[PDB]
């Protein structure tokens, strides 16, 4: 089984680019991160910052998570992110995504020792 920290890395980190380069970024990344294997993941956000900067968010601003848990943290600074969401023409096994690049604060849930991101809650 994949660890919670590794799953967060695979689903949400893309430190290789400063930002989405084209409208096809999400189609390519949702496929390469294996998020379209058996079904199309409907919504998924990628963070374009170093893994170290994302991990550092776990010691930044403690805020409530949407589900009410109290282990969420909001990055003090904005970060480059890309939201990937299925369009209307999307249908497994022919997934199709809209790519929306933005600079926002990220909110992640953290856990473990080391205390690292295990869930992407939202961006602001
Ligand atoms: Cl793994
Ligand atoms: Cl791990
Ligand atoms: Cl997400």
Q: Where are the domains of the chain?
A: 1-124
Q: Yes or no: is domain 1-124 CATH 3.40.50.150?
A: no
Centroid of ligand 3 to alpha carbon of 113 (angstroms)? 23
Residue 87 known to bind ligand: no
What are the beta bridge partners of residue 84?
A: 44, 99
Measured from the alpha carbon of residue 51, the closest ligand is 2
Question: What are φ and ψ of residue 73, in 5° steps?
Answer: -135, 140
- 19 CB burial (10 A radius; 0-12, 13-18, 19+): middle
**Would you name the residues annotated as active-site residues?**
12, 119
- 46 CB burial (10 A radius; 0-12, 13-18, 19+): buried
Centroid of ligand 1 to alpha carbon of 88 (angstroms)? 31
Q: How many angstroms is the resolution?
A: 1.6
Measured from the alpha carbon of residue 116, the closest ligand is 2
């Amino acid at each position: 089984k994949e660890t919670a920290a590794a799953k967060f890395e695979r689903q949400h980190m893309d430190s290789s680019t400063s930002a989405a380069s084209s409208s096809n970024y999400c189609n390519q990344m949702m496929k390469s991160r294996n998020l379209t294997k058996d079904r199309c993941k409907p919504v998924n956000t990628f963070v374009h910052e170093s893994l170290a900067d994302a991990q550092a968010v776990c010691s930044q601003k403690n805020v409530a998570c949407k589900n009410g848990q109290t282990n969420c943290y909001q990055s003090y600074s904005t970060m480059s992110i890309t939201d990937c969401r299925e369009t209307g023409s999307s249908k497994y096994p022919n997934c199709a995504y809209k790519t929306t690049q933005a600079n926002k604060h990220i909110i992640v849930a953290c856990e473990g020792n080391p205390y690292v991101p295990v869930h992407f809650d939202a961006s602001v």
